[PDB]
Amino acid sequence: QLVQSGPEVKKPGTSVKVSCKASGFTFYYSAVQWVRQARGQRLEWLGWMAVGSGKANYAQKFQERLTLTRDMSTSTAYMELSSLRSEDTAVYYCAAPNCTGGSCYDGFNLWGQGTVVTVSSASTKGPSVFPLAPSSKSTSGGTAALGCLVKDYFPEPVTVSWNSGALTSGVHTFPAVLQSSGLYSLSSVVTVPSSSLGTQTYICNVNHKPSNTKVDKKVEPKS
Amino acid sequence: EIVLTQSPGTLSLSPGDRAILSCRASQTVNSNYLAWYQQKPGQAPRLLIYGTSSRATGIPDRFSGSGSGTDFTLTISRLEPEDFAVYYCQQYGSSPWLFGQGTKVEIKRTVAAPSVFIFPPSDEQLKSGTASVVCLLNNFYPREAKVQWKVDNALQSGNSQESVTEQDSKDSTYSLSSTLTLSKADYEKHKVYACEVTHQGLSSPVTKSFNRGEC
Amino acid sequence: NLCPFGEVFNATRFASVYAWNRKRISNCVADYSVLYNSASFSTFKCYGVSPTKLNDLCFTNVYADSFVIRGDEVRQIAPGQTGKIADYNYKLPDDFTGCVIAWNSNNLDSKVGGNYNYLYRLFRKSNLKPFERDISTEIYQAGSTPCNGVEGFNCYFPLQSYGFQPTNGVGYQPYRVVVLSFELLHAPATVCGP
Ligand SMILES: *[C@@H]1O[C@H](CO)[C@@H](O[C@@H]2O[C@H](CO)[C@@H](O)[C@H](O)[C@H]2NC(C)=O)[C@H](O)[C@H]1NC(C)=O
Numbered sequence: 001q002l003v004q005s006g007p008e009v010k011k012p013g014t015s016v017k018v019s020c021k022a023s024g025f026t027f028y029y030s031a032v033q034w035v036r037q038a039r040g041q042r043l044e045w046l047g048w049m050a051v052g053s054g055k056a057n058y059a060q061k062f063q064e065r066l067t068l069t070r071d072m073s074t075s076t077a078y079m080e081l082s083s084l085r086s087e088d089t090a091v092y093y094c095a096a097p098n099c100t101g102g103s104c105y106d107g108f109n110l111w112g113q114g115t116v117v118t119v120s121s122a123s124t125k126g127p128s129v130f131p132l133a134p135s136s137k138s139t140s141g142g143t144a145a146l147g148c149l150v151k152d153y154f155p156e157p158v159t160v161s162w163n164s165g166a167l168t169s170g171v172h173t174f175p176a177v178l179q180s181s182g183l184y185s186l187s188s189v190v191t192v193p194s195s196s197l198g199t200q201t202y203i204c205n206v207n208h209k210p211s212n213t214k215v216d217k218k219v220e221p222k223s
Numbered sequence: 224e225i226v227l228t229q230s231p232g233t234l235s236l237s238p239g240d241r242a243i244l245s246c247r248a249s250q251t252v253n254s255n256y257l258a259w260y261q262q263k264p265g266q267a268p269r270l271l272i273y274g275t276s277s278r279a280t281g282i283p284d285r286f287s288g289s290g291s292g293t294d295f296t297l298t299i300s301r302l303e304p305e306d307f308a309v310y311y312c313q314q315y316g317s318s319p320w321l322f323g324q325g326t327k328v329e330i331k332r333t334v335a336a337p338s339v340f341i342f343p344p345s346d347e348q349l350k351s352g353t354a355s356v357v358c359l360l361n362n363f364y365p366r367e368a369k370v371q372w373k374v375d376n377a378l379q380s381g382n383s384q385e386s387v388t389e390q391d392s393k394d395s396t397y398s399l400s401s402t403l404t405l406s407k408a409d410y411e412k413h414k415v416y417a418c419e420v421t422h423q424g425l426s427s428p429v430t431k432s433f434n435r436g437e438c
Numbered sequence: 439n440l441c442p443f444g445e446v447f448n449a450t451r452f453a454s455v456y457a458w459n460r461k462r463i464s465n466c467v468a469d470y471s472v473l474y475n476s477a478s479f480s481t482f483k484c485y486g487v488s489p490t491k492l493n494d495l496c497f498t499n500v501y502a503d504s505f506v507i508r509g510d511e512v513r514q515i516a517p518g519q520t521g522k523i524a525d526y527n528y529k530l531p532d533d534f535t536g537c538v539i540a541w542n543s544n545n546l547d548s549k550v551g552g553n554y555n556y557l558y559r560l561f562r563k564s565n566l567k568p569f570e571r572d573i574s575t576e577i578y579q580a581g582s583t584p585c586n587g588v589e590g591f592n593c594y595f596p597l598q599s600y601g602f603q604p605t606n607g608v609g610y611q612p613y614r615v616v617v618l619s620f621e622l623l624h625a626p627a628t629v630c631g632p
Pocket of ligand 1: 443444447448473
């Protein structure tokens, strides 16, 4: 089994180091390769290294910035990248075959869980919740839709819930996008009948752990 | 170097029909160093075929690889609900182990017309100095769909960031959100706002318009 | 007439651990206490024979084996030890009789930029039996596919070289090891001291 380190957030021009600890098999006869993938994009190959002797191979794009090392004492493989840029935001994987003795498996069946690395300059900040109150124009054929808008939060993980988690029938949350200011923003909507407005307490439950701010923004129909 | 190109981009097939893929290279590739991987959204890739002909440990027998030289194929005898994912082909004989562009497999169903909504900005949003107008597209099967934001019969651009949800489970229809993050300055010096949608399931484009006079 | 221990212990060069050298010694008068009282060696362990009473004992012929290994690696040269060196480069029998000697050689074996003239084996198909050499350099086959003479995935070169730097720690410091093994067989039994 392969276990990696946690996510890290860096500043442009610095360097990062990711460790991929291995256990449960003879690590001496294996070999590790590193693959990264952006958000909703294709896999990209970086390089590979044979743990037995420390020899490594690199692609031409990342030849002068990528360094692969090993540690026999803890059976840990290290990867470092210097002079990070904005486009380097992705998730990184380490893969290696299952070696039992002299003989070993012929493919990279074992894979890690991945590490999220973000390169940016904007500092962390809490979010602001804006209600998407339904109106007469929004309503169409009895069906009504409403939700909440979240803005200007830097860390990726945010959560949306309704009725303290009780309202989930036909709930929609959309993947977060990146604005020009470097601060993320998403939207969450849900569908309710036009007879439901003005009868039930509708509120969206949200949270931002890095800011440790919890908001429950009640929404009311526009007058 | 070696470049890999999976010719069929996306395939939408109902369960039961056998599916095929085509991973074709530019130069002759060693037949003992080719593999196929399966990845679901949010999980690490899983190995399926290694050595161009043999399957991995615990992989059900329906998967089966074949071909050698510049042509390689992957065949699924009868699809299953959990086999809808993205499949990559990679070779590791030479020095650069380039991947393929990937192939996405999705459920095929009937064509459903989308739903169009408009959301005026909140009054509390007015204080921050930015206007937020959202046009919502709901429950449409074909992935292709485009929206043009229209202000006073003029097409505004540069503020139409796009967001698409993943395929749903019970019905497998997509939901689309477009947000017109607009500065306050343009808000007052224009009157009529509209978002026009065009979809394969609609005979004609449907224009949804909003005016600030009834706010 | 005295045995030529000085030429062995003061040689200009030493062999690699994977190609250690052997030199039998016979028909001569030896002296071990002069070697013992040098007060310059680091380790002097004699399994089965007391070093102080070596002079009062006689054998038929002795063997001298020498090589160079890393400082932290000296602990594997002993009977009944387990490690990569014992498995692939130099293995001692369980009933070994003789002595093992090793001392630091920084000022003679370490230079600026590194010395890459010493190599050690990495992989082998099977464990070594006691007292044999393996000078073959054929490509290893980790997987179940023939290498066919090309080095790549699951096809590794068996040998790599040490890297010795003057700034390295004492743990990575080079050490010179000399192993003496005494034999006893029906013979004139010539070699023994005064
Ligand atoms: C290796 O050579 C050194 C020096 O040539 C020998 O050390 C000398 O030993 C004699 C007799 O014990 C002394 O009189 C000298 O003063 C020593 N010289 C130095 C520089 O230490 C050493 O004995 C030789 N090795 C062996 C095994 O004989």
